[PDB]
């Protein structure tokens, strides 16, 4: 009987912010037939997942403030049944510290600014992260925020402070976060104190969910008899012109008529009264077509057209 045996030397090593790289090796005592062995991996905590992997290593992104627990077992894929060995598991403990001292409401926002200096990268991403101090945190807690994207890791330097000297919010003006990048952005916030240690809080932020599109600029509009034509420019972002949705808000200051028109182009044409005053505003966002739907841009500055 073909009795598959579990893999040995299964260790989980923290290789970066919110990553762990798992490694196993085939059992020396296994029968060495020409069978193409493969491996099945199970992530037990915190986000349950499982996958099939042929090589002896796999990288999984995950939050590490709640601890990590992974299981692996040798498998052999036959034509009728999936033979598997006994599960081999390893776990990564939770970091120490008194409960409730960890940070709460960690909200991170990413802007985009036009990098006019680098001839290669024209767009640059800036990060703003805010959080509230812990309930049982000591009065002299020193919180340090770290962000990581891809293989780039950095520590914050520009912070915001309350009356007690602790750190509420951080601001990265220059990040290696790609504006068109589509990888997870890991943010780790741990700290230190002379009275009681503080448990860290890491959270994987999707770039789409935290990217605040800038408002479009130069929204011009002209009367011509009874016809309005409104045009603007794409908002500053590494995504091209064709990857943005828009709406136009036209309000009449006399009667109160309001029109909202979503469109994919960059200009909108409408017919309104020739004896009323109007204001025009637009917003923008990265289309769900190009990137998963994210937060929408704020209203543009009002533009007042017509006469009353």
């Amino acid at each position: 009987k073909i009795s598959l045996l579990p893999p040995v030397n299964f260790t989980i090593k923290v290789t970066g912010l919110a990553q762990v790289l798992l490694q196993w090796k085939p059992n020396p005592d296994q029968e060495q037939r020409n069978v193409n062995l493969e491996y099945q991996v199970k992530i037990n905590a915190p986000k349950e997942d499982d996958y099939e992997t042929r090589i002896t290593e796999s990288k999984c992104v995950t939050i590490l403030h709640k601890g990590f627990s992974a299981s692996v077992r040798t498998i052999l894929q036959n034509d009728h049944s999936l033979l598997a060995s006994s599960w081999a598991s390893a776990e990564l403990h939770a970091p120490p510290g008194s409960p409730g001292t960890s940070i709460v409401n960690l909200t991170c926002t990413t802007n985009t600014t036009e990098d006019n200096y680098s001839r290669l990268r024209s767009y640059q991403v800036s990060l703003h992260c805010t959080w509230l101090v812990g309930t049982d945190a000591p009065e002299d807690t020193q919180y340090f925020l770290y962000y990581r994207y891809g293989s780039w890791t950095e520590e914050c330097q520009e912070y915001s402070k309350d009356t007690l000297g602790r750190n509420i919010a951080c601001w990265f003006p220059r990040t290696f976060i790609l504006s068109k990048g589509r990888d997870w952005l890991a943010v780790l916030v741990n700290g230190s104190s002379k009275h009681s240690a503080i448990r860290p809080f890491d959270q994987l932020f999707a770039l789409h969910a935290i990217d605040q599109i800038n408002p479009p600029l130069n929204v011009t509009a002209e009367i011509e008899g009874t016809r309005l034509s409104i045009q603007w420019e794409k908002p500053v972002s590494a995504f091209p012109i064709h990857c943005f949705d828009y709406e136009v808000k036209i309000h009449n200051t006399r009667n109160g008529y309001l029109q909202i028109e979503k469109l994919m182009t960059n200009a909108f044409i409408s017919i309104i009264d020739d004896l009323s005053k109007y204001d025009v505003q637009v917003r923008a966002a990265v289309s769900s077509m190009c990137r998963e739907a994210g937060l929408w841009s704020e209203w543009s500055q009002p533009i007042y057209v017509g006469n009353d």
Binding site: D49, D50, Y51, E52, T53, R54, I55, S58, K180, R182, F239, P240, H242, C243, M289, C290, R291, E292
Partner: protein, 109 residues
């Protein structure tokens, strides 16, 4: 030992050094792509590299240039192997497809 981030600079300097020693032949004819987004023709690129090594004289800086070329080919070989090392669930693969077609839209117009 070198990492996988300066081999390109090494190769670029070496190639800029020895253009005329490498384009000596006139009857030798090797393929060249025309499409943009060069990510998809690496195999043909290194096929041309192999033919060029089989023709060019292995002496001096050229030998270390071609050794560096093999070393950088190994990295793309590893990535191509990485594309099929792991097998995941249907939903994650569907999200991967959504990302793939989002790329197909933002670039690859």
């Amino acid at each position: 030992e070198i990492p996988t981030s300066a081999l390109v600079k090494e190769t670029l300097a070496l190639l800029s050094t020895h253009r005329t020693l490498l384009i000596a032949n006139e009857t030798l004819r090797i393929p060249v792509p025309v499409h943009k987004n060069h990510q998809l023709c690496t195999e043909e690129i290194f096929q041309g590299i192999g033919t060029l090594e089989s023709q060019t004289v292995q002496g001096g800086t050229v030998e270390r240039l071609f050794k560096n070329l093999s070393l950088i080919k190994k990295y793309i070989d590893g990535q191509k192997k990485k594309c099929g090392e792991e097998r995941r669930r249907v939903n994650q693969f569907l999200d991967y497809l959504q990302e793939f077609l989002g790329v197909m839209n933002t670039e690859w117009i």
